[PDB]
Design a protein around this nucleic acid. Structure first.
Ligand SMILES: [Mg+2]
Ligand SMILES: [Mg+2]
Ligand SMILES: [Mg+2]
Ligand SMILES: [Mg+2]
Ligand SMILES: [Mg+2]
Ligand SMILES: [Mg+2]
Ligand SMILES: [Mg+2]
Ligand SMILES: [Mg+2]
Ligand SMILES: [Mg+2]
Ligand SMILES: [Mg+2]
Ligand SMILES: [Mg+2]
Ligand SMILES: [Mg+2]
Ligand SMILES: [Mg+2]
Ligand SMILES: [Mg+2]
Ligand SMILES: [Mg+2]
Ligand SMILES: [Mg+2]
Ligand SMILES: [Mg+2]
Ligand SMILES: [Mg+2]
Ligand SMILES: [Mg+2]
Ligand SMILES: [Mg+2]
Ligand SMILES: [Mg+2]
Ligand SMILES: [Mg+2]
Ligand SMILES: [Mg+2]
Ligand SMILES: [Mg+2]
Ligand SMILES: [Mg+2]
Ligand SMILES: [Mg+2]
Ligand SMILES: [Mg+2]
Ligand SMILES: [Mg+2]
Ligand SMILES: [Mg+2]
Ligand SMILES: [Mg+2]
Ligand SMILES: [Mg+2]
Ligand SMILES: [Mg+2]
Ligand SMILES: [Mg+2]
Ligand SMILES: [Mg+2]
Ligand SMILES: [Mg+2]
Ligand SMILES: [Mg+2]
Ligand SMILES: [Mg+2]
Ligand SMILES: [Mg+2]
Ligand SMILES: [Mg+2]
Ligand SMILES: [Mg+2]
Ligand SMILES: [Mg+2]
Ligand SMILES: [Mg+2]
Ligand SMILES: [Mg+2]
Ligand SMILES: [Mg+2]
Ligand SMILES: [Mg+2]
Ligand SMILES: [Mg+2]
Ligand SMILES: [Mg+2]
Ligand SMILES: [Mg+2]
Ligand SMILES: [Mg+2]
Ligand SMILES: [Mg+2]
Ligand SMILES: [Mg+2]
Ligand SMILES: [Mg+2]
Ligand SMILES: [Mg+2]
Ligand SMILES: [Mg+2]
Ligand SMILES: [Mg+2]
Ligand SMILES: [Mg+2]
Ligand SMILES: [Mg+2]
Ligand SMILES: [Mg+2]
Ligand SMILES: [Mg+2]
Ligand SMILES: [Mg+2]
Ligand SMILES: [Mg+2]
Ligand SMILES: [Mg+2]
Ligand SMILES: [Mg+2]
Ligand SMILES: [Mg+2]
Ligand SMILES: [Mg+2]
Ligand SMILES: [Mg+2]
Ligand SMILES: [Mg+2]
Ligand SMILES: [Mg+2]
Ligand SMILES: [Mg+2]
Ligand SMILES: [Mg+2]
Ligand SMILES: [Mg+2]
Ligand SMILES: [Mg+2]
Ligand SMILES: [Mg+2]
Ligand SMILES: [Mg+2]
Ligand SMILES: [Mg+2]
Ligand SMILES: [Mg+2]
Ligand SMILES: [Mg+2]
Ligand SMILES: [Mg+2]
Ligand SMILES: [Mg+2]
Ligand SMILES: [Mg+2]
Ligand SMILES: [Mg+2]
Ligand SMILES: [Mg+2]
Ligand SMILES: [Mg+2]
Ligand SMILES: [Mg+2]
Ligand SMILES: [Mg+2]
Ligand SMILES: [Mg+2]
Ligand SMILES: [Mg+2]
Ligand SMILES: [Mg+2]
Ligand SMILES: [Mg+2]
Ligand SMILES: [Mg+2]
Ligand SMILES: [Mg+2]
Ligand SMILES: [Mg+2]
Ligand SMILES: [Mg+2]
Ligand SMILES: [Mg+2]
Ligand SMILES: [Mg+2]
Ligand SMILES: [Mg+2]
Ligand SMILES: [Mg+2]
Ligand SMILES: [Mg+2]
Ligand SMILES: [Mg+2]
Ligand SMILES: [Mg+2]
Ligand SMILES: [Mg+2]
Ligand SMILES: [Mg+2]
Ligand SMILES: [Mg+2]
Ligand SMILES: [Mg+2]
Ligand SMILES: [Mg+2]
Ligand SMILES: [Mg+2]
Ligand SMILES: [Mg+2]
Ligand SMILES: [Mg+2]
Ligand SMILES: [Mg+2]
Ligand SMILES: [Mg+2]
Ligand SMILES: [Mg+2]
Ligand SMILES: [Mg+2]
Ligand SMILES: [Mg+2]
Ligand SMILES: [Mg+2]
Ligand SMILES: [Mg+2]
Ligand SMILES: [Mg+2]
Ligand SMILES: [Mg+2]
Ligand SMILES: [Mg+2]
Ligand SMILES: [Mg+2]
Ligand SMILES: [Mg+2]
Ligand SMILES: [Mg+2]
Ligand SMILES: [Mg+2]
Ligand SMILES: [Mg+2]
Ligand SMILES: [Mg+2]
Ligand SMILES: [Mg+2]
Ligand SMILES: [Mg+2]
Ligand SMILES: [Mg+2]
Ligand SMILES: [Mg+2]
Ligand SMILES: [Mg+2]
Ligand SMILES: [Mg+2]
Ligand SMILES: [Mg+2]
Ligand SMILES: [Mg+2]
Ligand SMILES: [Mg+2]
Ligand SMILES: [Mg+2]
Ligand SMILES: [Mg+2]
Ligand SMILES: [Mg+2]
Ligand SMILES: [Mg+2]
Ligand SMILES: [Mg+2]
Ligand SMILES: [Mg+2]
Ligand SMILES: [Mg+2]
Ligand SMILES: [Mg+2]
Ligand SMILES: [Mg+2]
Ligand SMILES: [Mg+2]
Ligand SMILES: [Mg+2]
Ligand SMILES: [Mg+2]
Ligand SMILES: [Mg+2]
Ligand SMILES: [Mg+2]
Ligand SMILES: [Mg+2]
Ligand SMILES: [Mg+2]
Ligand SMILES: [Mg+2]
Ligand SMILES: [Mg+2]
Ligand SMILES: [Mg+2]
Ligand SMILES: [Mg+2]
Ligand SMILES: [Mg+2]
Ligand SMILES: [Mg+2]
Ligand SMILES: [Mg+2]
Ligand SMILES: [Mg+2]
Ligand SMILES: [Mg+2]
Ligand SMILES: [Mg+2]
Ligand SMILES: [Mg+2]
Ligand SMILES: [Mg+2]
Ligand SMILES: [Mg+2]
Ligand SMILES: [Mg+2]
Ligand SMILES: [Mg+2]
Ligand SMILES: [Mg+2]
Ligand SMILES: [Mg+2]
Ligand SMILES: [Mg+2]
Ligand SMILES: [Mg+2]
Ligand SMILES: [Mg+2]
Ligand SMILES: [Mg+2]
Ligand SMILES: [Mg+2]
Ligand SMILES: [Mg+2]
Ligand SMILES: [Mg+2]
Ligand SMILES: [Mg+2]
Ligand SMILES: [Mg+2]
Ligand SMILES: [Mg+2]
Ligand SMILES: [Mg+2]
Ligand SMILES: [Mg+2]
Ligand SMILES: [Mg+2]
Ligand SMILES: [Mg+2]
Ligand SMILES: [Mg+2]
Ligand SMILES: [Mg+2]
Ligand SMILES: [Mg+2]
Ligand SMILES: [Mg+2]
Ligand SMILES: [Mg+2]
Ligand SMILES: [Mg+2]
Ligand SMILES: [Mg+2]
Ligand SMILES: [Mg+2]
Ligand SMILES: [Mg+2]
Ligand SMILES: [Mg+2]
Ligand SMILES: [Mg+2]
Ligand SMILES: [Mg+2]
Ligand SMILES: [Mg+2]
Ligand SMILES: [Mg+2]
Ligand SMILES: [Mg+2]
Ligand SMILES: [Mg+2]
Ligand SMILES: [Mg+2]
Ligand SMILES: [Mg+2]
Ligand SMILES: [Mg+2]
Ligand SMILES: [Mg+2]
Ligand SMILES: [Mg+2]
Ligand SMILES: [Mg+2]
Ligand SMILES: [Mg+2]
Ligand SMILES: [Mg+2]
Ligand SMILES: [Mg+2]
Ligand SMILES: [Mg+2]
Ligand SMILES: [Mg+2]
Ligand SMILES: [Mg+2]
Ligand SMILES: [Mg+2]
Ligand SMILES: [Mg+2]
Ligand SMILES: [Mg+2]
Ligand SMILES: [Mg+2]
Ligand SMILES: [Mg+2]
Ligand SMILES: [Mg+2]
Ligand SMILES: [Mg+2]
Ligand SMILES: [Mg+2]
Ligand SMILES: [Mg+2]
Ligand SMILES: [Mg+2]
Ligand SMILES: [Mg+2]
Ligand SMILES: [Mg+2]
Ligand SMILES: [Mg+2]
Ligand SMILES: [Mg+2]
Ligand SMILES: [Mg+2]
Ligand SMILES: [Mg+2]
Ligand SMILES: [Mg+2]
Ligand SMILES: [Mg+2]
Ligand SMILES: [Mg+2]
Ligand SMILES: [Mg+2]
Ligand SMILES: [Mg+2]
Ligand SMILES: [Mg+2]
Ligand SMILES: [Mg+2]
Ligand SMILES: [Mg+2]
Ligand SMILES: [Mg+2]
Ligand SMILES: [Mg+2]
Ligand SMILES: [Mg+2]
Ligand SMILES: [Mg+2]
Ligand SMILES: [Mg+2]
Ligand SMILES: [Mg+2]
Ligand SMILES: [Mg+2]
Ligand SMILES: [Mg+2]
Ligand SMILES: [Mg+2]
Ligand SMILES: [Mg+2]
Ligand SMILES: [Mg+2]
Ligand SMILES: [Mg+2]
Ligand SMILES: [Mg+2]
Ligand SMILES: [Mg+2]
Ligand SMILES: [Mg+2]
Ligand SMILES: [Mg+2]
Ligand SMILES: [Mg+2]
Ligand SMILES: [Mg+2]
Ligand SMILES: [Mg+2]
Ligand SMILES: [Mg+2]
Ligand SMILES: [Mg+2]
Ligand SMILES: [Mg+2]
Ligand SMILES: [Mg+2]
Ligand SMILES: [Mg+2]
Ligand SMILES: [Mg+2]
Ligand SMILES: [Mg+2]
Ligand SMILES: [Mg+2]
Ligand SMILES: [Mg+2]
Ligand SMILES: [Mg+2]
Ligand SMILES: [Mg+2]
Ligand SMILES: [Mg+2]
Ligand SMILES: [Mg+2]
Ligand SMILES: [Mg+2]
Ligand SMILES: [Mg+2]
Ligand SMILES: [Mg+2]
Ligand SMILES: [Mg+2]
Ligand SMILES: [Mg+2]
Ligand SMILES: [Mg+2]
Ligand SMILES: [Mg+2]
Ligand SMILES: [Mg+2]
Ligand SMILES: [Mg+2]
Ligand SMILES: [Mg+2]
Ligand SMILES: [Mg+2]
Ligand SMILES: [Mg+2]
Ligand SMILES: [Mg+2]
Ligand SMILES: [Mg+2]
Ligand SMILES: [Mg+2]
Ligand SMILES: [Mg+2]
Ligand SMILES: [Mg+2]
Ligand SMILES: [Mg+2]
Ligand SMILES: [Mg+2]
Ligand SMILES: [Mg+2]
Ligand SMILES: [Mg+2]
Ligand SMILES: [Mg+2]
Ligand SMILES: [Mg+2]
Ligand SMILES: [Mg+2]
Ligand SMILES: [Mg+2]
Ligand SMILES: [Mg+2]
Ligand SMILES: [Mg+2]
Ligand SMILES: [Mg+2]
Ligand SMILES: [Mg+2]
Ligand SMILES: [Mg+2]
Ligand SMILES: [Mg+2]
Ligand SMILES: [Mg+2]
Ligand SMILES: [Mg+2]
Ligand SMILES: [Mg+2]
Ligand SMILES: [Mg+2]
Ligand SMILES: [Mg+2]
Ligand SMILES: [Mg+2]
Ligand SMILES: [Mg+2]
Ligand SMILES: [Mg+2]
Ligand SMILES: [Mg+2]
Ligand SMILES: [Mg+2]
Ligand SMILES: [Mg+2]
Ligand SMILES: [Mg+2]
Ligand SMILES: [Mg+2]
Ligand SMILES: [Mg+2]
Ligand SMILES: [Mg+2]
Ligand SMILES: [Mg+2]
Ligand SMILES: [Mg+2]
Ligand SMILES: [Mg+2]
Ligand SMILES: [Mg+2]
Ligand SMILES: [Mg+2]
Ligand SMILES: [Mg+2]
Ligand SMILES: [Mg+2]
Ligand SMILES: [Mg+2]
Ligand SMILES: [Mg+2]
Ligand SMILES: [Mg+2]
Ligand SMILES: [Mg+2]
Ligand SMILES: [Mg+2]
Ligand SMILES: [Mg+2]
Ligand SMILES: [Mg+2]
Ligand SMILES: [Mg+2]
Ligand SMILES: [Mg+2]
Ligand SMILES: [Mg+2]
Ligand SMILES: [Mg+2]
Lengths: 102, 92, 60, 77, 45
RNA sequence: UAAGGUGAUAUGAACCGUUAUAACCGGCGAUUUCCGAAUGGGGAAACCCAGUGUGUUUCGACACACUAUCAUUAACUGAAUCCAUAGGUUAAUGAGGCGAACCGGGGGAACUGAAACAUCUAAGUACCCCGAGGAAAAGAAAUCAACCGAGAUUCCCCCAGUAGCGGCGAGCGAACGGGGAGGAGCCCAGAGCCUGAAUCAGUGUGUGUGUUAGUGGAAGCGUCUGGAAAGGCGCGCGAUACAGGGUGACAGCCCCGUACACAAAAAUGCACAUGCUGUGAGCUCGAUGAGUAGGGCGGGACACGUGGUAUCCUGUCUGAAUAUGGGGGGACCAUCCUCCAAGGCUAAAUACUCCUGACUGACCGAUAGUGAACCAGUACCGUGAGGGAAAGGCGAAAAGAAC
RNA sequence: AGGACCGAACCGACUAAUGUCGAAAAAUUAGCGGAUGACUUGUGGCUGGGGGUGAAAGGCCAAUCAAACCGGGAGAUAGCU
RNA sequence: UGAAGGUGUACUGUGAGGUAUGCUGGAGGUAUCAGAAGUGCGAAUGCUGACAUAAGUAACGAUAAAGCGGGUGAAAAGCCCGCUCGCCGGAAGACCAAGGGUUCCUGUCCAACGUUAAUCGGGGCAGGGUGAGUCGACCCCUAAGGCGAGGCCGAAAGGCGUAGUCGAUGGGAAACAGGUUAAUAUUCCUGUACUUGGUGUUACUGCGAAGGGGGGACGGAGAAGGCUAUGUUGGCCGGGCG
RNA sequence: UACGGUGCUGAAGCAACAAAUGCCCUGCUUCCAGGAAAAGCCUCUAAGCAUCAGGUAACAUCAAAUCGUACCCCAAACCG
């Protein structure tokens, strides 16, 4: 029952990029999301002989801990906790305070 | 004559110089077979799967090399190869 | 596929085993070692599909 | 082994005490003998390895009564 | 100059092998021990 | 359960999935090579050689099953011999082996202490061997008391380092009795009327539970310092949840949990209605365990070393009375009292932890703690039994340094 | 014919020197003894610790021997350092 | 707005010590008064790790011996090739068994390994390499001996041993010459052969053992003859004319 | 000619002498210390079988599985 997931607009609670927003690209098994335009790390990509060999520095989007992000409300205009309930047969998520469905 | 199992005998065609020189000049095919696989079972397999006239099969067991990976030593698997001579009606 | 294969005849289900073995597994196994094969996932799913069949024909 | 078939007397251990009370380990063996008993029930001789007491038990009871007790335990004779 | 170890695989296995240990009650206790200790080489074999 | 996946070093490649037959996690299934009790014969374990009976086969050959030993049971077929008996086949069915400690039995040291040493001690300890079971063993008085009465065994606390034993040295050391834990009894050595009934155990099913998957699960913001805030500062709010953990520094309120409320298609540990192949309640007449008790000889166990030594056990040689009888009450005798041997079966309290969980430490923190935080019973050493190491930490994130 | 003679292989080890943290935990160099026999040697067996084996030195039994080695009793015991 | 730890400095107590602070460090520390100790090390020929000393000393492993030119390389006494020289030749050559277990061959790489350097290597890293009816093993048979159904014996464990079954160092069927790979060849290839089986076909006929007999089937030494491997010398054939 | 070699031919291809510790010889002579076993092999019959199955011969035919095979092997590869 993961609260932050794939196609979900989040906001960052802690880190150099505090307050920035974006969509999650892929949550990892270790418990870390990769949100786009957040942890831009300037990697030095070594030109490997096989396949492509560009030879240049690149701004990769590094992972961030799931707990450092919270789903954006798009109504209140700020971070918000996530819950779980059974609307109809299936299980679904909801926002704490202003109880709406995602 | 031993259906279904014959398919599991032949693993792969072997690639080498010695393998190549025995294609044209000697009229054979070298190939990796199952560790069981008798000369009859190889012949009978080549006769149905590859579908060519087999003169005779010569067989040998290759021993695995003891390699390294930093600290932990490891030995490769003992595979078995089969020099299969073919008749005048040959192709591949 | 298991649900569809579960409703089959005992003699007819062998033909799928023999078809899975004849080509597919052998063909891809010979084709993989020669370097002609790009799609490597096929070796696995066939091996599973055999297991599936061979389990399904263990009815007694 | 040195065991009476009838009574089950087997060799027990004990000390052999000297005048100065030196304890030295020993064994008391039973007085075993292979003896042939006439079983009148089925008209034959039956050889048993019995103690000298065993014989007295076979004489007190009947050889057949003793063989009945022997056969119940799962023995041969 | 003629050392103590003069190897022979037949002698080795006849003397110290798995079946040679399996033959005797004392030999089975050796194996029981090596297993209990948890050895890889249970016997020379 | 579920939006992510195809275990790790560990990439990458190629592909699954995304409202659900991807993955994952549990219950039952299937598959389960070869060695290993190994079990068709052998054997330098992981190899070699069959036999038999079924199916197939296109000459070439295949496939599957079975065939170990012993212990009972059954049919048998059966020698020296008249009938047999030994035997030999066949087939049921059980066993075989492994395992940390705990338990009962069969054997059983020495160092050591005695300031030497031989009785004695260490000690029925170490060790070896056999049979176990979830516990085991013991167990319903031929008990032990003292003219009072106790009422099977077991374990704990006293009695008591007492009485005793003892080269009366070193040392060993009770019981009676009292307080507790736990409590429970039966069956055989058989004949009337009357009858299957109360007891063990089927097998059930069928409820209640538990166990092996799980679901929900409360309420924080703003500034300041900093690489980063959970921090400081100031105001909020949930608390049957402030156990604990993570998160870029110390988080009740970011995340995982926690209290709490809830779960099972299924296979199991349980907990009583209860149809019942199957098994005698009651009731009286009695019977009431012989090479035994006891004795001599030799050993052993009793706290008790043969001593004045009861009692128990027996290797050996002997031998009653058998309820008008017999046993014990610590030499022995006589009176009183008390029990009824020579056949069995019995839960609980009790011992242990290889192993599965949870939780806790005035336990350790890498020369410690397991030998082993790490691919350790590994490397290495030894013919072998066997011995046996060293070796942890970049950072918040590889952003692991393109050029 | 020969436990005959001389003498290589093979088996040995009398003398000397070197070596003695060696090239080597017993060797090398130069000479030395036996060399058809009580010879020598390969392969495989058997004998086990108060036990073996010994043309007998207390020799040898895996570089260990007037009682092997490994584990255990075991932290034996030590009026001694 | 910088803890412990490390490292300095300055005060301070009669001592074990204590206090404050600079730098390093980058996260823990802990008053007071009580409580509990794996509570204090210089010695134990203490135990583990690290590092000295002797010392840039001895040594570099047979006194069979090198030399030079060219190549390759960042570099050449050592590697490759060439020409001399030297050494072994009942071996220091060539095949095996045992024992090792990839050390073989090719390409590449010199950190460590190599008692020096190293382009070389039995080193690292890839890839390649072992082809059998006839060779050996397995298989039929046995010695020494081992195991051993029942059995006899033994407190238990187990000891001995019979019918059997294992156990070679022994007995039992058959292939040679030439060519070939970087690395296998009696195994691949060419030319010639052979040996045991099954299943036939056929003419012909007594076959048939857990049994009998024969053979297998055997010592030392010696001597002699006949041979051959092999050599030597002629002839013959091709080259040579110093 | 890749100065690696690749791929064509290719003459004589005999005689004497010497000679083993090899081979005939598992033999012969001799001596005593008197020198494995068991199968394969050959042969004879019992229990049986009697046109049979079984033998024998000859033209076939099908087969001859599995494992080892590199390399060192008086040594830089084994034991030290
Ligand atoms: Mg914040
Ligand atoms: Mg990253
Ligand atoms: Mg659902
Ligand atoms: Mg051929
Ligand atoms: Mg061939
Ligand atoms: Mg082969
Ligand atoms: Mg090999
Ligand atoms: Mg392997
Ligand atoms: Mg491989
Ligand atoms: Mg593997
Ligand atoms: Mg004593
Ligand atoms: Mg060694
Ligand atoms: Mg040897
Ligand atoms: Mg041996
Ligand atoms: Mg999985
Ligand atoms: Mg993976
Ligand atoms: Mg990946
Ligand atoms: Mg579902
Ligand atoms: Mg479905
Ligand atoms: Mg699926
Ligand atoms: Mg479903
Ligand atoms: Mg699944
Ligand atoms: Mg799964
Ligand atoms: Mg699962
Ligand atoms: Mg599972
Ligand atoms: Mg499942
Ligand atoms: Mg399961
Ligand atoms: Mg399984
Ligand atoms: Mg399995
Ligand atoms: Mg198999
Ligand atoms: Mg098995
Ligand atoms: Mg076996
Ligand atoms: Mg079986
Ligand atoms: Mg059986
Ligand atoms: Mg078997
Ligand atoms: Mg056999
Ligand atoms: Mg067996
Ligand atoms: Mg063999
Ligand atoms: Mg084997
Ligand atoms: Mg058959
Ligand atoms: Mg059967
Ligand atoms: Mg009956
Ligand atoms: Mg009968
Ligand atoms: Mg009859
Ligand atoms: Mg008669
Ligand atoms: Mg009769
Ligand atoms: Mg008769
Ligand atoms: Mg009868
Ligand atoms: Mg019988
Ligand atoms: Mg049976
Ligand atoms: Mg059975
Ligand atoms: Mg049992
Ligand atoms: Mg058992
Ligand atoms: Mg016990
Ligand atoms: Mg008892
Ligand atoms: Mg006992
Ligand atoms: Mg006892
Ligand atoms: Mg003593
Ligand atoms: Mg003493
Ligand atoms: Mg003393
Ligand atoms: Mg003492
Ligand atoms: Mg003393
Ligand atoms: Mg003394
Ligand atoms: Mg003591
Ligand atoms: Mg005893
Ligand atoms: Mg049981
Ligand atoms: Mg229980
Ligand atoms: Mg149970
Ligand atoms: Mg139970
Ligand atoms: Mg009991
Ligand atoms: Mg009892
Ligand atoms: Mg009572
Ligand atoms: Mg009673
Ligand atoms: Mg009673
Ligand atoms: Mg009572
Ligand atoms: Mg009573
Ligand atoms: Mg009492
Ligand atoms: Mg009274
Ligand atoms: Mg009482
Ligand atoms: Mg009482
Ligand atoms: Mg009363
Ligand atoms: Mg008192
Ligand atoms: Mg008192
Ligand atoms: Mg007294
Ligand atoms: Mg006295
Ligand atoms: Mg005195
Ligand atoms: Mg005592
Ligand atoms: Mg005591
Ligand atoms: Mg005591
Ligand atoms: Mg008491
Ligand atoms: Mg009492
Ligand atoms: Mg009372
Ligand atoms: Mg009570
Ligand atoms: Mg009851
Ligand atoms: Mg009764
Ligand atoms: Mg009755
Ligand atoms: Mg039930
Ligand atoms: Mg139920
Ligand atoms: Mg519940
Ligand atoms: Mg859950
Ligand atoms: Mg949840
Ligand atoms: Mg929550
Ligand atoms: Mg700031
Ligand atoms: Mg700033
Ligand atoms: Mg702060
Ligand atoms: Mg402050
Ligand atoms: Mg605050
Ligand atoms: Mg405030
Ligand atoms: Mg406030
Ligand atoms: Mg507050
Ligand atoms: Mg708290
Ligand atoms: Mg709590
Ligand atoms: Mg709490
Ligand atoms: Mg943390
Ligand atoms: Mg920090
Ligand atoms: Mg932290
Ligand atoms: Mg706060
Ligand atoms: Mg707070
Ligand atoms: Mg916050
Ligand atoms: Mg809980
Ligand atoms: Mg509640
Ligand atoms: Mg439920
Ligand atoms: Mg359901
Ligand atoms: Mg059910
Ligand atoms: Mg059920
Ligand atoms: Mg249970
Ligand atoms: Mg009675
Ligand atoms: Mg009675
Ligand atoms: Mg009686
Ligand atoms: Mg008396
Ligand atoms: Mg008596
Ligand atoms: Mg008496
Ligand atoms: Mg008496
Ligand atoms: Mg007397
Ligand atoms: Mg007397
Ligand atoms: Mg006496
Ligand atoms: Mg005394
Ligand atoms: Mg005593
Ligand atoms: Mg006494
Ligand atoms: Mg007396
Ligand atoms: Mg006295
Ligand atoms: Mg006395
Ligand atoms: Mg009395
Ligand atoms: Mg008494
Ligand atoms: Mg009477
Ligand atoms: Mg009477
Ligand atoms: Mg009396
Ligand atoms: Mg009495
Ligand atoms: Mg009396
Ligand atoms: Mg008295
Ligand atoms: Mg008494
Ligand atoms: Mg009176
Ligand atoms: Mg009375
Ligand atoms: Mg009564
Ligand atoms: Mg008695
Ligand atoms: Mg009883
Ligand atoms: Mg019971
Ligand atoms: Mg009860
Ligand atoms: Mg417990
Ligand atoms: Mg535990
Ligand atoms: Mg602690
Ligand atoms: Mg450690
Ligand atoms: Mg440290
Ligand atoms: Mg360290
Ligand atoms: Mg070793
Ligand atoms: Mg390691
Ligand atoms: Mg470190
Ligand atoms: Mg760099
Ligand atoms: Mg001589
Ligand atoms: Mg010479
Ligand atoms: Mg020599
Ligand atoms: Mg030699
Ligand atoms: Mg020599
Ligand atoms: Mg000398
Ligand atoms: Mg010498
Ligand atoms: Mg001379
Ligand atoms: Mg000489
Ligand atoms: Mg002489
Ligand atoms: Mg001489
Ligand atoms: Mg001479
Ligand atoms: Mg002579
Ligand atoms: Mg030998
Ligand atoms: Mg021995
Ligand atoms: Mg002696
Ligand atoms: Mg002895
Ligand atoms: Mg002397
Ligand atoms: Mg000794
Ligand atoms: Mg001694
Ligand atoms: Mg020792
Ligand atoms: Mg000591
Ligand atoms: Mg002691
Ligand atoms: Mg500041
Ligand atoms: Mg400040
Ligand atoms: Mg601290
Ligand atoms: Mg400080
Ligand atoms: Mg410091
Ligand atoms: Mg520093
Ligand atoms: Mg400071
Ligand atoms: Mg700093
Ligand atoms: Mg921190
Ligand atoms: Mg912390
Ligand atoms: Mg404090
Ligand atoms: Mg204090
Ligand atoms: Mg204090
Ligand atoms: Mg200390
Ligand atoms: Mg000191
Ligand atoms: Mg120190
Ligand atoms: Mg000091
Ligand atoms: Mg001192
Ligand atoms: Mg020291
Ligand atoms: Mg020191
Ligand atoms: Mg000097
Ligand atoms: Mg100098
Ligand atoms: Mg000098
Ligand atoms: Mg010098
Ligand atoms: Mg020197
Ligand atoms: Mg030199
Ligand atoms: Mg040199
Ligand atoms: Mg020299
Ligand atoms: Mg030399
Ligand atoms: Mg030189
Ligand atoms: Mg030179
Ligand atoms: Mg030069
Ligand atoms: Mg040059
Ligand atoms: Mg140059
Ligand atoms: Mg140059
Ligand atoms: Mg270059
Ligand atoms: Mg340069
Ligand atoms: Mg250099
Ligand atoms: Mg040069
Ligand atoms: Mg040189
Ligand atoms: Mg060279
Ligand atoms: Mg040269
Ligand atoms: Mg020369
Ligand atoms: Mg020569
Ligand atoms: Mg060579
Ligand atoms: Mg060769
Ligand atoms: Mg060869
Ligand atoms: Mg060879
Ligand atoms: Mg080696
Ligand atoms: Mg070899
Ligand atoms: Mg290598
Ligand atoms: Mg090259
Ligand atoms: Mg190169
Ligand atoms: Mg260099
Ligand atoms: Mg380097
Ligand atoms: Mg380098
Ligand atoms: Mg080096
Ligand atoms: Mg070097
Ligand atoms: Mg070279
Ligand atoms: Mg190389
Ligand atoms: Mg080489
Ligand atoms: Mg190489
Ligand atoms: Mg190399
Ligand atoms: Mg490397
Ligand atoms: Mg490469
Ligand atoms: Mg590669
Ligand atoms: Mg061949
Ligand atoms: Mg062959
Ligand atoms: Mg050929
Ligand atoms: Mg060959
Ligand atoms: Mg052969
Ligand atoms: Mg074979
Ligand atoms: Mg046996
Ligand atoms: Mg039998
Ligand atoms: Mg037996
Ligand atoms: Mg006799
Ligand atoms: Mg036995
Ligand atoms: Mg035996
Ligand atoms: Mg034996
Ligand atoms: Mg035997
Ligand atoms: Mg027979
Ligand atoms: Mg035999
Ligand atoms: Mg056989
Ligand atoms: Mg045999
Ligand atoms: Mg041989
Ligand atoms: Mg041989
Ligand atoms: Mg042979
Ligand atoms: Mg032969
Ligand atoms: Mg042979
Ligand atoms: Mg031949
Ligand atoms: Mg030949
Ligand atoms: Mg070669
Ligand atoms: Mg040839
Ligand atoms: Mg050919
Ligand atoms: Mg021919
Ligand atoms: Mg032929
Ligand atoms: Mg035929
Ligand atoms: Mg024929
Ligand atoms: Mg015809
Ligand atoms: Mg005939
Ligand atoms: Mg015949
Ligand atoms: Mg015959
Ligand atoms: Mg011979
Ligand atoms: Mg001879
Ligand atoms: Mg000779
Ligand atoms: Mg002679
Ligand atoms: Mg002579
Ligand atoms: Mg002549
Ligand atoms: Mg002549
Ligand atoms: Mg002539
Ligand atoms: Mg000639
Ligand atoms: Mg010659
Ligand atoms: Mg000559
Ligand atoms: Mg000339
Ligand atoms: Mg001319
Ligand atoms: Mg001239
Ligand atoms: Mg010509
Ligand atoms: Mg010609
Ligand atoms: Mg001549
Ligand atoms: Mg001649
Ligand atoms: Mg001659
Ligand atoms: Mg000679
Ligand atoms: Mg020769
Ligand atoms: Mg000869
Ligand atoms: Mg005819
Ligand atoms: Mg015929
Ligand atoms: Mg032909
Ligand atoms: Mg032919
Ligand atoms: Mg053919
Ligand atoms: Mg064959
Ligand atoms: Mg070779
Ligand atoms: Mg050589
Ligand atoms: Mg040589
Ligand atoms: Mg040689
Ligand atoms: Mg050589
Ligand atoms: Mg070596
Ligand atoms: Mg050594």
């Amino acid at each position: 029952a993961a609260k932050i997931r794939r196609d979900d607009e989040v906001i960052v609670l802690t880190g150099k990029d505090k307050g920035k927003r974006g969509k999650v690209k892929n949550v990892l098994s270790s418990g870390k999301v990769i949100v786009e335009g957040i942890n831009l790390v300037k990697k030095h990509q070594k030109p490997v002989p096989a396949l492509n060999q560009p030879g240049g520095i690149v701004e990769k989007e590094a992972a961030i801990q799931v707990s450092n992000v919270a789903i954006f409300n798009a109504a209140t205009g700020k971070a918000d906790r996530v819950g779980f309930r059974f609307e109809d047969g299936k299980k679904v998520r909801f926002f704490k305070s202003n109880s709406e469905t995602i | 004559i031993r259906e279904e199992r014959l398919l599991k005998v032949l693993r792969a065609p072997h690639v080498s110089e010695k393998a190549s020189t025995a294609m044209e000049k000697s009229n054979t095919i070298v190939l990796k077979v199952a560790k069981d696989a008798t000369k009859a079972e190889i012949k009978a397999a080549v006769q149905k799967l590859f579908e060519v006239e087999v003169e005779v099969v010569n067989t040998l067991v290759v021993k695995g090399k003891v390699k390294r990976h930093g600290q932990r030593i490891g030995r490769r698997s003992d595979w078995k190869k089969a020099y299969v001579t073919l008749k005048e009606g040959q192709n591949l | 596929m298991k649900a569809k294969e579960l409703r089959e005849k005992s003699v007819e289900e062998l033909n799928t085993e023999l078809l899975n073995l004849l080509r597919e597994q052998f063909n891809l196994r010979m084709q993989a070692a020669s370097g002609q094969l790009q799609q490597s996932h096929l070796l696995k799913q066939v091996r599973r599909d055999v297991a599936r069949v061979k389990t399904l024909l263990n009815e007694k | 082994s040195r065991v009476c078939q009838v009574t089950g007397k087997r060799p027990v251990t004990g000390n052999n005490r000297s005048h100065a009370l030196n304890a030295t380990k020993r064994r008391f063996l039973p007085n075993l003998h292979s003896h042939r008993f006439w079983v009148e029930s089925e008209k034959r001789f039956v050889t048993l390895r019995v103690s000298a007491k065993g014989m007295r038990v076979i004489d007190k009871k009947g050889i057949d009564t003793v063989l009945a007790e022997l056969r119940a335990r799962g023995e041969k004779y | 100059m003629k050392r103590t170890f003069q190897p022979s695989v037949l002698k080795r296995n006849r003397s110290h092998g798995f079946r040679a240990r399996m033959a005797t009650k004392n030999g089975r206790q050796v194996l029981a021990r090596r297993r209990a200790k948890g050895r890889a080489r249970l016997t020379v074999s």
